[PDB]
C-alpha cells in the first residue's frame, strides 16, 4: 500500500507522489518517471517489489505534470526537475520510516538522465540507477526550423497567447526536434504508448507538452553533467533493442564512469519493455541487489 | 541623448534599459553587461559612440539586476538571460527607429557568453560581438564543497530563510566555486573593481549575488552551446593579459566557429580594461566596422 506524500520546492511548488512505506526505518528509493510520464505508468509494479524487499519507495509526478504543481503545464525542464529532486530528497529524508543515510535515486528513460544530474550535486544520493537513459534530443537537420518555431512561440506569447502545446509524438511518430526515435520505429511506438494511456490510473495524464520544452532541451548538455558523477555508485540498465535511445550512446556514457558501477543489458527489450515481460523479475532483483551492496549506511 | 525603454518577457518580468536612438530607421545593437553588472558601468560611453555612428543602441540591466524586475535579486541565471534576450530582441525590433533586419547582439565578459547563447537559437541576430567572454566557472577542487553549500542553502530556504547572498569576489579575490580569477591576481582585481563601482557613479549596483547563481553555473555548458552558433558572423575581442578568462580558452572557442568570423586581441589589456585607455577607440571602431561589413 501507499500514501500520498507531497514535497515543497524552494519556489513554493508542491510535488505530489505515492510513498510506499516500510515498517521501522529503512532505505528509500526515489523514482523519477520518463518524458511527460505520470507516476502511475509502469512504476507502481516496481515500487511494490521495492517495498516488499524493504525499500521505502517514492514515485512522483515531476513539476507541471500529472498531480503536481507547476506552470506552464507539461513544460519539461530537465534542469528544474534535477533541482526539484534535491528538495524531494530533503522531504523524503525527513519521513519517520526513512533512513536519511540510505537514499537512492532511480530514473527511467528521460528520468534516469534527470536523476544523474541531481546525483551530480547532492552527496545525500548514495546510489544512482538509470534505466534506458536518453542522452541526446536534436537531429541536426531539424535544429534551425525548431529554433525558429520556438522564437515564434515566444513572439505569440508576448502578444498575449498561451504557450503552444503539441503531442510529444504525432501519428507519424515524429516531433519538431527529432527526439526519442522520431522518424523511426521508436517514435511510432512512443506515439502508441502515449496515446494508449487511454485507460484509468491517472486523471491528470495529459498527452501534450509545451513547445518551450524544446528550448530547455536545447540548453541541456547531460553528457557533460554525467561527467560530474564521479563518486556515486551507478547501475545502468540498457535495452538491447532500444529504438528511442541508442544503446551505444548509453554505453558510451557508462564507460566514462570511474567509480563503482554495473551495466545490465536487457536482451531483446526496447525502451518501453525493458522492465516488462520475461527477464523483468531478474532485472528488478538486480537493482535491489546493487542498492543493497552499495547503500549500506 | 537616450530614453528609458522597457521590454517585457514571456513570464511577465520587466527588463529596463537605456535606448540610444538614431534618426530615421537604422540598425540596432543590444548590449548585455558582465556578471552582476549594471548598464551604467562603462557601456554608456560605448553606446554614445555606436549612436553617433548610426546604431540604435540598447543597454539594459538583466533580470533581477539593477533597475530590472526579477526575484530573487541578483540571481545570475545565464540561460534565462539568453532567453530574455529573445524577448528583448522582439521589443527592440518593434521600435520605430529600428530596422528589424539588422539586429546585433553585443556582450562584455559573462554577457558576451550569454549573447552567444541567444544568437544560437535566434536567426534575427545577424551579428554577434563577444568581448572577453568567460567560458568556464568551476575549479574542480572546489566543486564538492560548493555543491554541498548549495544544497544547504536550499534547505535553509525550505525552512523559510532568504536565499544566501555573498559578494562575487571576497577581499582575497575568491569565491566558493573558483570563478573568474579566484585565487589569483584576476580575482583580486575583480574584488577591487566591484568594490569601487558605487563610488565610480553607478547607483543601482548591489555588490552581492544569490549563492544559487552557482547552481545555474554548474548546469551551464556554454562551450557546447557556442558550437550551435555556426552561422552568425562573430567578432571576438580578447584582452592579451586577461587574468579572469584565460585568453587561450577564448581562442579555443573562436577556433571552432565555422562561419564568417574575426578575432581581435587587445595588446596589454586585461579583462576589465580591454575597452579602456589606449587603443580603445580603434577597438570600438573595429566593432562597428565588423557589424556594417556583415549586417
Ligand atoms: Cl516506521
Ligand atoms: Cl534518519
Ligand atoms: Na532545420
From TrEMBL, chain A:
<dbReference type="InterPro" id="IPR051411">
    <property type="entry name" value="Polyketide_trans_af380"/>
</dbReference>
<dbReference type="InterPro" id="IPR029058">
    <property type="entry name" value="AB_hydrolase_fold"/>
</dbReference>
<dbReference type="InterPro" id="IPR000073">
    <property type="entry name" value="AB_hydrolase_1"/>
</dbReference>
<dbReference type="Pfam" id="PF00561">
    <property type="entry name" value="Abhydrolase_1"/>
</dbReference>
<protein>
    <submittedName>
        <fullName>DltD domain-containing protein</fullName>
    </submittedName>
</protein>
<comment type="similarity">
    <text>Belongs to the polyketide transferase af380 family.</text>
</comment>
<feature type="domain" description="AB hydrolase-1">
    <location>
        <begin position="27"/>
        <end position="149"/>
    </location>
</feature>
Amino acid at each position: 500500500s501507499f500514501q500520498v506524500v507531497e514535497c515543497k520546492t524552494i519556489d513554493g511548488i508542491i510535488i505530489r507522489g505515492r510513498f510506499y512505506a516500510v515498517d521501522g526505518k529503512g532505505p528509500a528509493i526515489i523514482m523519477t518517471p520518463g518524458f511527460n510520464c505520470v507516476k502511475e505508468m509502469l512504476l507502481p509494479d516496481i515500487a511494490e517489489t521495492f517495498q516488499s524487499q524493504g525499500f521505502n519507495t517514492y514515485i512522483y509526478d515531476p513539476r507541471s505534470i500529472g498531480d503536481s504543481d507547476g506552470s506552464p503545464k507539461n513544460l519539461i525542464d530537465p534542469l528544474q526537475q534535477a533541482e526539484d529532486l534535491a528538495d524531494i530528497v530533503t522531504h523524503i529524508s525527513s519521513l519517520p520510516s526513512v533512513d536519511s543515510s540510505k537514499i537512492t535515486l532511480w530514473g527511467m528513460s528521460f528520468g534516469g538522465t534527470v536523476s544523474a544530474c541531481a546525483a551530480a550535486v547532492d552527496r545525500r544520493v548514495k546510489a544512482l540507477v538509470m534505466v534506458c537513459p536518453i542522452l541526446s534530443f536534436y537531429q541536426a537537420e531539424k535544429r534551425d526550423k525548431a529554433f525558429l518555431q520556438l522564437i515564434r512561440d515566444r513572439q505569440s506569447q508576448l502578444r498575449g497567447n498561451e504557450p503552444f502545446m503539441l503531442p510529444p509524438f504525432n501519428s507519424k511518430g515524429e516531433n519538431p526536434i527529432g527526439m526519442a526515435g522520431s522518424g523511426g520505429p521508436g517514435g511510432i511506438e512512443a506515439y502508441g504508448f502515449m496515446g494508449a494511456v487511454i485507460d484509468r490510473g491517472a486523471p491528470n495524464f495529459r498527452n501534450k507538452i509545451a513547445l518551450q520544452t524544446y528550448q530547455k532541451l536545447a540548453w541541456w548538455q547531460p553528457k557533460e553533467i554525467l561527467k560530474l558523477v564521479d563518486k556515486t555508485p551507478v547501475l545502468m540498465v540498457t535495452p538491447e533493442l532500444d529504438t528511442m535511445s541508442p544503446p551505444e550512446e548509453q554505453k558510451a556514457a557508462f564507460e566514462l564512469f570511474p567509480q563503482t558501477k554495473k551495466f545490465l543489458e536487457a536482451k531483446g527489450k526496447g525502451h518501453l519493455t525493458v522492465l516488462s515481460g520475461e527477464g523483468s523479475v531478474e532485472v528488478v532483483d538486480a537493482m535491489t541487489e546493487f542498492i543493497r551492496e552499495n547503500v549500506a549506511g
